[PDB]
Amino acid sequence: MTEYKLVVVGAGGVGKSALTIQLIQNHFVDECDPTIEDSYRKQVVIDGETCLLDILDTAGQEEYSAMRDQYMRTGEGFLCVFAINNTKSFEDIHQYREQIKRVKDSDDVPMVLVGNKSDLAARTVESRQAQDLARSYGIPYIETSAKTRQGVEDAFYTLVREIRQH
Numbered sequence: 527m528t529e530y531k532l533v534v535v536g537a538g539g540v541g542k543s544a545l546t547i548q549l550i551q552n553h554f555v556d557e558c559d560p561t562i563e564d565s566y567r568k569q570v571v572i573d574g575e576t577c578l579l580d581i582l583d584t585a586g587q588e589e590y591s592a593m594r595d596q597y598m599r600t601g602e603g604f605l606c607v608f609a610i611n612n613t614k615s616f617e618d619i620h621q622y623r624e625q626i627k628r629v630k631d632s633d634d635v636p637m638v639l640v641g642n643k644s645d646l647a648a649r650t651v652e653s654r655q656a657q658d659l660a661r662s663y664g665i666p667y668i669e670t671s672a673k674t675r676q677g678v679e680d681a682f683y684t685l686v687r688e689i690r691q692h
């Protein structure tokens with residue numbers, strides 16, 4: 527029925543795959559499996575609407591390319607992931623945001639900012655600066671853990687609400 531094209535973007539190793547698998551398959555993967563591209567599709571219920579999620583798990587940049595453009599350009603909404611113990615992945619959200627806007631050639635793209643690995647202590651990115659980042663872009667912010675499942679439904683189902691509202 528009603529499909530939602532989602533894309534999971536952000537730096538290498540911030541938990542993009544781990545997040546998606548947890549949502550779709552309901553377990554935590556504790557392994558090193560670099561992604562080229564992988565998609566996941568599951569029927570779920572969101573606020574009483576039966577719908578399909580069509581989800582695209584990307585690679586960290588390593589850089590923009592036409593090939594990467596070719597995969598991402600069909601996405602409807604973007605889950606922009608960083609990890610709260612890795613300041614570089616946080617500094618990188620600006621680039622993706624920007625890249626996503628250029629790929630979709632739009633000044634308003636459905637988006638949500640995700641801060642992953644919330645089970646880990648001694649964070650290097652405070653919730654305040656990140657929450658302030660989401661607000662400066664006018665988009666929501668959700669903290670998550672692929673390991674504990676904290677926030678993971680919130681993050682994804684929220685992006686769907688941003689897609690419904692655009």
Ligand SMILES: C[C@@H](OP(=O)(O)OP(=O)(O)OP(=O)(O)OC[C@H]1O[C@@H](n2cnc3c(=O)[nH]c(N)nc32)[C@H](O)[C@@H]1O)c1ccccc1[N+](=O)[O-]
Nearest residue numbers: 538539540541542543544555556560561586643671672673
């Ligand atoms: C090549 C690149 O690959 P990548 O595809 O850029 O990396 P992903 O963003 O898909 O990241 P992934 O979900 O594979 O998780 C990487 C590691 O962090 C762990 N992890 C993910 N989410 C969480 C979480 O919420 N909590 C905790 N405690 N751990 C979590 C995983 O168990 C794994 O060991 C890549 C892949 C794997 C590892 C690193 C890496 N990198 O570039 O840095």
Ligand SMILES: *CC(=O)N(C)CCN(C)c1ccc([N+](=O)[O-])c2nonc12
Nearest residue numbers: 537538539556557558559560561586588
């Ligand atoms: C699991 C994994 O990342 N690989 C099989 C790729 C090869 N490895 C082990 C690898 C690649 C790149 C980097 N890096 O530049 O950071 C690595 N750091 O530790 N293992 C790395």
Ligand SMILES: [Mg+2]
Nearest residue numbers: 542543560561
């Ligand atoms: Mg991955």
